[PDB]
Write a protein that binds this DNA or RNA. Structure first.
Length: 1117
RNA sequence: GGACCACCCCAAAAAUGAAGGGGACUAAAACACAAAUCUAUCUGAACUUCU
């Protein structure tokens, strides 16, 4: 019986009591909802025809008691009178079950009132510490210090041994294995015999409640009532005497037999009672054996102790004198703390992209250095430091640094200046340290707009000139023009069809601060699916070429996309406009649909009670309902809150596209006699743009300038100085982190209800016209292609041998390079000599006969891909004969087997499997940074929670800093280890665990705490001297303080492997060590109906599937 | 040490059903103008409807 998450209501805890709260207003809804749940649904109260019809009848009928009346509500002998549609003497049968329903509601009503806000900053002897006020947090605050931690473990072991006696558990493990279904009560009623409730309710329940009223002291109650159970005496001390008695070492032991009994009950509710669950039967052996169970419960109370101490440190920076942490505070706090862990992550990628752009052989980072400034010696006071930008000019890498600078920036550098460039790398490195110090100074003052302030940083002569040549209104016109050309618009439209387009649609480049809008891709893809379900009148372009259709749709998307973000979202979100005209329409289109008029079970019924009076506030209510009902649906689904919100922005867009009034975008697209006249138009303009990247200010031809005269822009940033440094960070970022940085700045604005990065998000969108997808005229040294190719068993290195290698000239084709898109990302992040070593171990090479088979099968896919689409059409919509007999089935099987063995073979010689491998290795390493950033935030929280004094702890978590008294030099791990040694100076072996001889094994193997500097600096990527399965091993050792993070390491790695089409079965041995048992590429099922003949056509090739398993296991030497 | 196959919080006279609830409160995800294609689509309830 779910109580919350049903309207907009949710349990939100407050100062005086916890409260059921309708989404926005803080009024009490606890009495309103719990009176509404006080009803007996009459289908409970009961092959598939008589049963299935009666359940639909009595689900409408509810039996409630308002007020002490048995009247029924619309949605045995007394049950049939309702079925024959025909008072109080009859319905008194149900009060036996409604009194059990009433007592559940009164117990839940008291369950919400005690779930109140706990954490309160206090001020005892001039230090600001945070304590809990709840009954449990009084126990955790007693054992808060690290000295009393061993007494906390012993009291759990003492309480566990008084409740569970090694054969009561041993019989209880047997009953969990020896059930399948409907036998839960035998486990349950035996477990109540272990606790002993039958000699508790019947002997002490009514006795002890009288004596609580008299003696008002636990010491006097035990003297008054002797011979209590050790668990019952533990329960009374928790409820009636824990708030108001002082905690001695003798009376602290009463609270632990109740804390252990909760944990054993929570294990039964998850692994026995509810759903069993779907996990295993081998899991149960690991959980419930007595020596494992005694270890697991104390490994779970020590988790709950450490989350308290971590919360007392987290709520010490974020809270004033002065305040109690209500759920309004806590939820806003988490969305600001998740903001910080995304800016720590964006400065770890920006270091990493600055290490590839300036190739360091040491892979050792970065201060201080990257400009030449001398410093005084101990003797003589005369030296010159080793600046890495001056290490260019010793190795003469300036032909290669300028090559790496071109991939990130597209500015024409001149390495002969060499003082202008060393000032440019200073302004990149000072910009990353500026947002690094912003994380520190978002503690004393909660203003996130000042972490991108970039104060006291003057831009270079390059970075000023580079920014103004990417903002001014003439250059943005030649990026709109490049996006129009690259989307094949000039080839599939007439000249006046697009001049009429450019006179109307304006290009902004304004964030508009609207939450939860769908992207237009993922919304264009729904059109042909939803075309019949909604009154759309659209025609997706269909042509018999299927490479022409991909290029018309790529022009169909881009032309409608600038309508969607530019003109549409200003119309569709103004208070004048049709938002609720469409929102009430789609709820009616689902209600008045067929087969929902049969049974009124349409899914959009839970939206009809929402009005909200504003289209912008309506989304913030739907996006609030979405965030509270995430994680309920399994497999998961097309989720309702996103599916409903994609219908509004697609019905409303196609209504905005019909009314006023451009609708010639359908027939783009149609006149084949026109496309002959525009066939070479894309080639003439692309030849111009390659002459534009070689030199900008040449000349603009007349046919170019007729488009550029009409392209209109919304807003220009006008060059403030602090955006100049924020631009240099964003060019050092891939697309996945750049949208995470786009998302985290939007979620900061919607959480704090202010606009603070509206100048920053406007500059992210001026990088949204920069992704070119024909990337990026980089050089392709032909030796570097040929480390993956084997010409007669040897790597092709000579450029003449590459022409000798192939014949069909899908490679070299002199005198040029075919320049595949896969080698862009593998070289920008290179990670190019690494994937040589992985491919050499796995034998992944491009054979001659395997490349020769490519050009044979390439002239056969167009026969196979067309024949697959034709036979699939007989399967989906026959409409004529109700055929697709078995002779069509076997012909469809041989069609998709040939597409499968070609697409696996196309992706190998087009290097798309290396672009998938590089995309997979880097996606894992960008995710594991996000766990070491949680570790850095939760490291200062445990230390500030343990020690509210000792202000030197904050001096650990600084990054230059020149101010520190005790911990001067080093990064976080190098300064934490000397904090750890001077704290445990009397408690070896813990010093010798971090001793200077032990630390060399600890650092080289990247064990317990040196994996944090290893992951966050991306030190895997040049050499990989420790494998991923040992990085993931050492990260779970690092995150062992928090169990929800130690468990979510492997869950986030399996889910990354599942996005790239792999099903991973890891094994974790008896030693803490991870190995892959099996990888399989996930099966694309064809013909999902007909229930017997599926085809399973796996996505990634088996040769790539082996090659990923080597990548996790690859270690240097 | 065994992840994937979470975690935390509140509820013990009557109301021993702790056989219950809660969590944007806490992680994982999801949402976002990168990419990638061979999975009919569309309704629904804990396989079943559709033109």
């Amino acid at each position: 019986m779910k109580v919350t998450k049903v309207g907009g209501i949710s349990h939100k805890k407050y100062t005086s009591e916890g409260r059921l709260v309708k989404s926005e207003s803080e009024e009490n809804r606890t009495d309103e909802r719990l009176s509404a749940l006080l009803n007996m649904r009459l289908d409970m109260y009961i092959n598939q025809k008589r049963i299935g019809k009666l359940k639909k009848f009595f689900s409408n009928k509810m039996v409630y008691l308002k007020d002490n009346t048995l009247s029924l509500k619309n949605g045995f002998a007394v049950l049939k009178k309702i079925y024959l549609n025909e008072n109080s003497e009859e319905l008194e049968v149900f009060r036996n079950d409604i009194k059990k329903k009433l007592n559940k509601i009164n117990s839940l009503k008291y369950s919400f009132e005690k779930n109140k806000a706990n954490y309160q900053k206090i001020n005892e002897n001039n230090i600001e510490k945070v304590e809990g006020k709840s009954k449990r947090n009084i126990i955790y605050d007693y054992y808060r210090e690290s000295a009393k931690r061993d007494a906390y473990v012993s009291n759990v072991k003492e309480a566990f041994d008084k409740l569970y006696k090694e054969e009561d558990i041993a019989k209880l493990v047997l009953e969990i294995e020896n059930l399948t279904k409907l036998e839960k009560y035998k486990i349950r009623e035996f477990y109540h015999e272990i606790i002993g409730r039958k000699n508790d309710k019947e002997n002490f329940a009514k006795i002890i409640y009288e004596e609580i009223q008299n003696v008002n002291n636990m010491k006097e109650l035990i003297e008054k009532v002797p011979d209590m159970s050790e668990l019952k005496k533990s329960q009374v001390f928790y409820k009636y005497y824990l708030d108001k008695e002082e905690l001695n070492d003798k009376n602290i032991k009463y609270a632990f037999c109740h804390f252990v009994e909760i944990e054993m009950s929570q294990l039964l509710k998850n692994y026995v009672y509810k759903r069993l669950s779907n996990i295993s039967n081998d899991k149960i052996k690991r959980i419930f054996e007595y020596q494992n169970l005694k270890k697991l419960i104390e490994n779970k109370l020590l988790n709950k102790l450490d989350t308290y101490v971590r919360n007392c440190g987290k709520y010490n920076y974020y809270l004033q004198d002065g305040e109690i942490a209500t759920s309004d505070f806590i939820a806003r706090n988490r969305q600001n703390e998740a903001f910080l862990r995304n800016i720590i992550g964006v400065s770890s990628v920006a270091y990493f992209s600055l290490r590839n752009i300036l190739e360091t052989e040491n892979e050792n980072d970065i201060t201080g250095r990257m400009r030449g400034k001398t410093v005084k010696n101990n003797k003589g006071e005369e030296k010159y430091v080793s600046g890495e930008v001056d290490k260019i000019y010793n190795e003469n890498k300036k032909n290669e640094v300028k090559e790496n600078l071109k991939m990130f920036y597209s500015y024409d550098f001149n390495m002969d200046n060499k003082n202008e460039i060393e000032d440019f790398f200073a302004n990149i490195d000072e910009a990353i340290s500026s947002i690094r110090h912003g994380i520190v100074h978002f503690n004393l003052e909660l203003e996130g707009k000042d972490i991108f302030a970039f104060k006291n940083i003057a831009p270079s002569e390059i970075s000023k000139k580079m920014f103004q040549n990417e903002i001014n209104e003439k250059k943005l016109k030649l990026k709109i023009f490049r996006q129009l050309n690259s989307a094949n618009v000039f080839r599939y439209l007439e000249k006046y069809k697009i001049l009429n387009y450019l006179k109307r649609t304006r290009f902004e480049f304004v964030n508009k601060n609207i939450p939860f809008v769908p992207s237009f891709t993922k919304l264009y893809s729904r059109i042909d699916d939803l075309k019949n379900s909604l009154g759309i009148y659209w025609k997706t372009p269909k042509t018999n070429d299927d490479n022409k259709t991909k290029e018309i749709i790529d022009a169909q998307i881009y032309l409608l996309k600038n309508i969607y973000y530019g003109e549409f979202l200003n119309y569709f979100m103004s208070n004048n406009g049709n938002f609720f005209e469409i929102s009430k329409e789609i709820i009616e289109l689902n209600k008045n649909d067929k087969r929902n008029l049969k049974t009124g079970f349409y899914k959009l019924q839970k939206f009809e009670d929402i009005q909200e009076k504003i289209p912008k506030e309506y989304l913030a209510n739907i996006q609030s309902l979405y965030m509270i009902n995430a994680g309920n649906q399994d497999e998961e689904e097309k989720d309702t809150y996103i599916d409903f919100i994609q219908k509004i922005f697609l019905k409303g867009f196609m209504t905005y596209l019909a009314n006023n009034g451009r609708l010639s975008l359908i027939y783009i697209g149609s006149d084949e006699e026109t496309n002959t006249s525009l066939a070479e138009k894309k080639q003439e303009f692309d030849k111009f743009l390659k002459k534009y990247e070689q030199n900008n200010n040449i000349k603009i031809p007349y046919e170019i300038n007729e488009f550029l005269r009409e392209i209109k822009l919304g807003n220009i940033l006008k060059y403030t100085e602090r955006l100049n440094m924020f631009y240099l960070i964003l060019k050092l970022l891939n697309h996945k982190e750049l949208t995470n940085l786009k998302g985290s700045l939007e979620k900061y604005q919607s959480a704090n209800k202010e606009e603070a990065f509206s100048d920053q998000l406007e500059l992210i969108n001026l990088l949204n016209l920069d992704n070119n997808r024909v990337t990026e005229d980089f050089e392709l040294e032909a030796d570097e292609i040929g480390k993956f190719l084997d010409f007669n068993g040897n790597k092709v290195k000579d450029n003449k041998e590459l022409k000798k290698f192939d014949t069909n000239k899908i490679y070299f084709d002199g005198e040029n390079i075919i320049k595949h898109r896969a080698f862009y990302n593998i070289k920008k992040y290179g990670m190019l000599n690494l994937l040589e070593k992985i491919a050499d171990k796995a034998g992944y090479k491009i054979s001659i006969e395997e490349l020769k088979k490519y050009s044979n099968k390439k002239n056969e896919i167009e026969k196979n891909h067309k024949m697959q689409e034709n036979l699939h059409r007989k399967y989906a919509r026959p409409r004529k004969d109700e055929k697709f007999t078995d002779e069509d089935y076997e012909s469809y099987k041989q069609a998709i087997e040939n597409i499968e063995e070609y697409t696996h073979l196309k992706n190998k010689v087009e290097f798309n499997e290396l672009n998938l491998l590089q995309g997979l290795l880097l996606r894992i390493l960008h995710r594991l940074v996000g766990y070491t950033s949680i570790w850095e935030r939760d490291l200062r929280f445990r230390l500030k929670g343990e020690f509210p004094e000792n202000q030197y702890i904050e001096e650990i978590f600084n990054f230059e800093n020149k101010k520190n008294v005790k911990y001067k030099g080093g990064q976080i791990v190098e300064k934490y280890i000397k904090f750890y040694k001077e704290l445990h100076q009397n408690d070896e072996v813990k010093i010798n665990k971090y001793s200077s001889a032990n630390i060399k094994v600890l650092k080289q193997e990247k064990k317990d705490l040196y994996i944090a500097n290893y992951i966050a600096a991306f030190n895997y990527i040049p050499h990989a001297e420790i494998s991923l399965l040992e990085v993931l091993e050492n990260l779970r050792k690092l995150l062992s303080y928090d169990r929800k993070l130690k468990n979510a390491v492997m869950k986030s790695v399996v889910d990354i492997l599942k996005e790239y089409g792999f099903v991973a079965t890891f094994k974790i041995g008896a030693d803490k060590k991870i190995g892959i048992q099996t990888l399989e590429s996930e099966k694309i099922v064809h013909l999902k109906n007909l229930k017997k003949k599926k085809l399973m056509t796996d996505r990634n090739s088996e040769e790539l599937c082996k090659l990923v398993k080597i990548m996790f296991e690859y270690k240097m030497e």
